[PDB]
């Protein structure tokens, strides 16, 4: 079953104290009114970022796992809470498919929902909302820690009564900075035409009228390459496939130019015992140019 | 390459660049002469030893086999790159081969990425699938370090101080000492390395625990929380006005 994310996907993009200004920010964000998986444990993809929302009063879920292979002996970020302190580690502790060495990093330090934003060095944001489960009101997240790892991540997992996960998207967002300096309202710049107008006019009030806002630039469906027929091929066969050839002293030099250099037979074919060249790629020869070439044949 | 965090301290880069031991010392986006008086949020030191001929490629924007598949800097990097001859302490007679480097990979390395995975490189048409052989080269290739070779093949020790100059509470602040807090008068203030002129006055602002300084619509600093005391300040510019003769 799935649930909507009414207005979640905005954190504080910067550390400055902004006040009384409609400020524009662009970053990876989760679009407002987007779908999340209403999970009641499994493995999920990771594209650019992740959002998280946990429904629990007893701290059931305390950590996460990350990485590409997500298997033992593979570098993974491990955040864990031991009920006495919270630990952040990069130790790939042995984990099977459903978990309930070479340690490199270490760090030890119903009523509410925790919202987490991840992106890639690593970033973390969160904030808490003491509620008497998801109100549709404004949501902004405060950065927590940005601990670097310098490693590729394309997937992740969870540690272990429900939670919500949603994927952030590249977008443009605008913030109503008040006198108080916090965030009280933000409007998407790609949800609905009124919102796009609010952003382009850069205000929360639009007086009646036509307003040109942006463009409709269609994207291409595919990329086409067209050229003349492959004719004509150089006679490399004559030099290579010659039954009779001239001896090492009497070698035949064949000048070659104005030819389609089909290097495929030379290197795609594995029959030839030695294919040696220095300063030029044996596999990329089709991608290089030579004005004039000569060929010598002997035994 | 190992990454050692440098933070929660005070630094002195003047001795580091002045010393004659550093035959190579190149700074990008900052000039060393004024490193002493500007503070930084975090400094990263990455240590790795490269062959001599490939020092000049490791710079933002440049490529090369190690520059591409082994270590690469952002094209917009800020900081300094440091290198020097290391035959004396590292290279041993008879050949030093305890060092390796990755040469062939399917994809290039994006900024600050480290790869130590150990699978063969598939270069041929047919997948190797764990077979070593023709067109199946393991990516790691060792350095052949003989203490007598030419400097072009000699080992240079390298550390990259990537100065991450960020707007955040800074940690490594440089040697320059403080001066007593001044208020309600025109002064050339300098907090955490931001050079400014204006009158300090306490503000009504309340910062979020990670918040450091505010801003104005014209991208001019308008408030700062004092570094050694949580003093919210208002950087009002000193009075000025046009004068016209009659």
């Amino acid at each position, epitope marked *: 079953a799935y649930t909507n994310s009414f207005t979640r996907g905005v954190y504080y993009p910067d550390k400055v104290f902004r006040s009384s200004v409609l400020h524009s920010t662009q970053d990876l964000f989760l679009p407002f009114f987007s779908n999340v998986t209403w999970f009641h444990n499994p493995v999920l993809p990771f594209n650019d970022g992740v959002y998280f929302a946990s429904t629990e009063k007893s701290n059931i879920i305390r950590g996460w796992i990350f990485g590409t292979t997500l298997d033992s002996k593979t570098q993974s970020l491990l955040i864990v809470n031991n009920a006495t302190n919270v630990v952040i580690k990069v130790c790939e502790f042995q984990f099977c498919n459903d978990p309930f060495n070479n340690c490199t990093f270490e760090y030890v330090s119903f009523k509410n929902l925790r919202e987490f934003v991840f992106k890639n060095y690593f970033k973390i944001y969160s904030k808490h909302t003491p509620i008497n489960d998801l109100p549709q009101g404004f949501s902004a997240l405060e950065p927590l820690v940005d601990l670097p790892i310098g490693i590729n991540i394309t997937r992740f997992q969870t540690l272990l009564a429900a939670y919500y996960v949603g994927y952030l998207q590249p977008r443009t967002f605008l913030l109503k900075y008040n006198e108080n300096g916090t965030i009280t309202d933000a409007v998407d710049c790609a949800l609905d035409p009124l919102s796009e107008t609010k952003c382009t006019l850069k205000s929360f009030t639009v007086e009646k009228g036509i307003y040109q806002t942006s463009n409709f630039r269609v994207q291409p469906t595919e990329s086409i390459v067209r050229f003349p027929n492959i004719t004509n091929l150089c006679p490399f066969g004559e030099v290579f496939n010659a039954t009779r050839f001239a001896s090492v002293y009497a070698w035949n030099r064949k000048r070659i130019s104005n030819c389609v250099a089909d290097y495929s037979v030379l290197y795609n074919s594995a029959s030839f015992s*030695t*294919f*040696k*060249c*220095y300063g030029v790629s*044996p596999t990329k020869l089709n991608d290089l140019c030579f004005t004039n070439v000569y060929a010598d044949s002997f035994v | 390459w190992n990454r050692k965090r440098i933070s929660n301290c005070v630094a002195d880069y003047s001795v580091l660049y002045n010393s004659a031991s550093f035959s190579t010392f190149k700074c990008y986006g900052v000039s060393p002469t004024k490193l002493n008086d500007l503070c930084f949020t975090n400094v990263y030191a990455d240590s790795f030893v490269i062959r001599g001929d490939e020092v000049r490629q490791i710079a933002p924007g440049q490529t090369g086999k190690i520059a591409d598949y082994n270590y690469k800097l952002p094209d917009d990097f800020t900081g300094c790159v440091i290198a020097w001859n290391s035959n004396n302490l590292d290279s041993k007679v*008879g*050949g*030093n*081969y*305890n060092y*390796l480097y990755r040469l062939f990979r399917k994809s290039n390395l994006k900024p600050f990425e480290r790869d130590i995975s*150990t699978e*063969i490189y598939q270069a041929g048409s047919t997948p190797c699938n*764990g*077979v*070593e*052989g*023709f*067109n*199946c*080269y*393991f990516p*790691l*290739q*060792s350095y*052949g370090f003989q203490p007598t070779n030419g400097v072009g093949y000699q080992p240079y020790r390298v550390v990259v101080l990537s100065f991450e100059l960020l707007h955040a509470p800074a940690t490594v602040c440089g040697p320059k000492k403080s001066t007593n807090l001044v208020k309600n008068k025109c002064v050339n203030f300098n907090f955490n390395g931001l050079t400014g002129t204006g009158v300090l006055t306490e503000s009504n602002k309340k910062f979020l625990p990670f918040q450091q300084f505010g801003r104005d619509i014209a991208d001019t600093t308008d408030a700062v929380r004092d570094p050694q005391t949580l003093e919210i300040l208002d950087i009002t510019p000193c009075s000025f006005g046009g004068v016209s003769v009659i």
Partner: nanobody, 117 residues
Framework: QVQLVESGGGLVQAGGSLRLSCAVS??????VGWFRRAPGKEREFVAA????????NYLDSVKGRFTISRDNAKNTIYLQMNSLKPQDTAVYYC????????????WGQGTQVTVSS
């Protein structure tokens, strides 16, 4: 250049541990490897180690039961045959790489290893 010569190949009983040791000329900067020609099959990988290296890979057939060693002192290499089951008989060879476009640039003429059940 670098030249390879092999020693220590012969007939041994099933389960026997033999010593194959191949000598090289001017080695030190090349990832040495051991290879075998099966009577009915072409050459296949056995073991490979870099200079002063721990980079070890073995085929599943040789997994857990053959290890190679590098002296770095006597200019020769050692491969550990343990309980060699009979169907692993072949002619063994050494090979190494400096800069290659084929499997490996320099090879060893090798020798014969035979096992009787």
């Amino acid at each position: 250049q670098v030249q390879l010569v092999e020693s220590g190949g012969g007939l041994v009983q099933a389960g026997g541990s033999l010593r194959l040791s191949c000598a090289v000329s001017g080695l030190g900067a090349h990832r040495v490897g051991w290879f075998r020609r099966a009577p009915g099959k072409e050459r296949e990988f056995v073991a490979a180690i870099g200079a002063n290296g721990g980079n070890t890979n073995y085929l599943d057939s040789v997994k857990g039961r053959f290890t190679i060693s590098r002296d770095n002192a006597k200019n020769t290499i050692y491969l550990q045959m343990n309980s060699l089951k009979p169907q692993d008989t072949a002619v063994y060879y050494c090979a190494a790489r400096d800069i290659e476009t084929a499997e490996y640039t320099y090879w060893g003429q090798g020798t014969q290893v035979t096992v009787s059940s």
